[PDB]
């Protein structure tokens, strides 16, 4: 499946015919049925990473939001992702915001979304993952782990209890869990990144996680915004260390609108993803790595659409990367593209593998 054909004919046509939410629903459907380009790239040993208690056959994952309800996991591995993250999942089903709630900014290679945690809920996702639980166990053992990203319901009183319920229900079924406190589309949610709120929330999450039988006990990561103050970042790093949080996902979408955006839809409310987020996210990785002394694994995400973009985040401190918005524009071939370019650049820059490149900018 040609990189050129998808980039220059297929994705532009689908974009010309369908609004972005319809296009995404069709993509989830096709992916869930395995109707994808092959994909030929075979992962070399230079791309394997060991982190979070697992082997990852390659460091390129699908970011949360694409497969919100765990419907397409196997088709995402078939696409060539080293790991798959589903969600965000909320405790109770909820519809999210009214449509339209997602917008393309093609001149910016960006998207703005305001889905507001549309979710089938924990029970539905639980059963969906349970139907393939041993298939995933084998995938995980073969180097293809599964992450589950947890959110909170719009009308929930007690946010921490929403996250605890998620840990209890889906934790067993996940190699890692993500406490998503950085959606910009749920009122008040990002205030959970504040020191006191985060410590209270994560103490409860970790207690529930530690209460799970050893074989079912996932790593716990916290996904953070790209819009944090210095004080916020220092506070997060402190809490992450005080509690022994397994890792950080850096970053969610931005509420900022960087100067220079050209898309007609630039002033729509929501989080902005894609190329204009890229270096903001990279910078946030760099800072969090330094504040955590390189001892806390980071999954780097925001604006990755090439091997260079991947390597930049790796060298800034990410152990793994994810992408979401690049797919919208370039389609499935972009996965093998990132990986082939990443391997080439690692060789060019004198790294024996991804592992050797993690945090390399900090040792220069
Ligand atoms: C349409 C859309 C929906 C998303 N929904 C979620 C979500 O449910 N949970 C989450 O943690 N992040 C979500 N994200 C954020 C992505 O996981 C990722 O952090 C962000 O888009 C940056 O990566 P990208 O520039 O490669 O898209 C969403 C992103 C987009 C574009
Ligand atoms: C008419 O629609 C199609 O032919 C589509 C679609 N959609 C086809 S034909 C063969 C094929 O790979 N697709 C296809 C295109 C995009 C995507 C896709 C788009 C966005 C994604 O976000 C991460 C992930 C996958 C998935 C697909 F499975
Ligand atoms: O609106 C959502 O559901 C969603 C959007 C997004 O950009 N990030 C997130 O965590 N949730």
Give the topology, please:
Elements: H1 3-17, H2 20-32, E1 49-51, E2 54-56, E3 60-62, H3 73-78, E4 83-89, E5 102-105, E6 110-113, H4 122-130, H5 133-141, E7 146-150, H6 159-170, E8 176-180, H7 195-210, E9 219-224, H8 230-243, E10 247-250, E11 271-274, H9 278-291, E12 298-301, H10 307-316, E13 320-323, H11 325-330, H12 333-348, H13 354-357
Parallel strand pairs: 3-4, 3-13, 4-7, 7-8, 8-9, 9-10, 10-12, 12-13
Antiparallel strand pairs: 1-2, 5-6, 6-11
Task: Characterise this structure.
There is one protein chain. With 364 residues, the protein is an alpha/beta fold. The termini are far apart. The strands form three sheets. It has an eight-stranded parallel β-barrel, surrounded by five helices. A three-stranded antiparallel β-sheet has the order 5-6-11, with no helix packed on it. Helix 6 packs parallel to helix 7 and helix 9 runs parallel beside helix 10. It has a single domain, classed as TIM Barrel (Alpha-Beta Barrel), CATH 3.20.20.70. Bound molecules: flavin mononucleotide, the ligand COC(=O)/C(C#N)=C1\SCC(=O)N1c1ccc(-c2ccc(OC)cc2)cc1F and orotic acid. The site of flavin mononucleotide has 26 residues, from strand 4, strand 6, strand 11 and helix 11. Catalyzes the conversion of dihydroorotate to orotate with quinone as electron acceptor. Required for UMP biosynthesis via de novo pathway. It is found in: Mitochondrion inner membrane. Pfam families: DHO_dh (PF01180).
């Amino acid at each position: 499946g040609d990189e050129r054909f998808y980039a220059e004919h297929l994705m532009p046509t689908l974009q010309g015919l369908l609004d972005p939410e319809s296009a995404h629903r069709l993509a989830v459907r096709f992916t869930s049925l395995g109707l994808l380009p092959r994909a030929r790239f075979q992962d070399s040993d230079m791309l394997e990473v060991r982190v979070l208690g697992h082997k990852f056959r390659n460091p390129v994952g699908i970011a949360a939001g694409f497969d919100k309800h765990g419907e397409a996991v196997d088709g995402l591995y078939k696409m060539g992702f080293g790991f798959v993250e589903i969600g965000s999942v909320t405790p109770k089903p909820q519809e999210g915001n009214p449509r339209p709630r997602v917008f393309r900014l093609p001149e910016d290679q960006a998207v703005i979304n305001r889905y507001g945690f549309n979710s089938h809920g924990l029970s539905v996702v639980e059963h969906r993952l349970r139907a393939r639980q041993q298939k995933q166990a084998k995938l995980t053992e073969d180097g293809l782990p599964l992450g589950v990203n947890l959110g909170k319901n719009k009308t929930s009183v007690d946010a921490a209890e929403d996250y605890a319920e998620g840990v209890r229900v889906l934790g067993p079924l996940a190699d890692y869990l993500v406490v998503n406190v950085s959606s910009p589309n749920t009122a008040g949610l990002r205030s959970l990144q504040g020191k006191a709120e985060l410590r209270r929330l994560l103490t409860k999450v970790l207690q529930e996680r530690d209460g799970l039988r050893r074989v079912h006990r996932p790593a716990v990561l916290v996904k953070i915004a790209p819009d944090l103050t210095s004080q916020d970042k220092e506070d997060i790093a402190s809490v992450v260390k005080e509690l022994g949080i397994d890792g950080l996902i850096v970053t969610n979408t931005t509420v900022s609108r960087p100067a220079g955006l050209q898309g007609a839809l630039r002033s729509e409310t929501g989080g902005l993803s894609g190329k204009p987020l890229r270096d903001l996210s990279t910078q946030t990785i760099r800072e969090m790595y330094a504040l955590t002394q390189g001892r806390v694994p980071i999954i780097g995400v925001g604006g990755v659409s090439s091997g260079q973009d991947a390597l930049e985040k790796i060298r800034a401190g990410a152990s793994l990367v994810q992408l979401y918005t690049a797919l919208t524009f370039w389609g499935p071939p972009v996965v093998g593209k990132v990986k082939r370019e990443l391997e080439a650049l690692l060789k060019e820059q004198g790294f024996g593998g991804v592992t050797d490149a993690i945090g390399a900018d900090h040792r220069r």
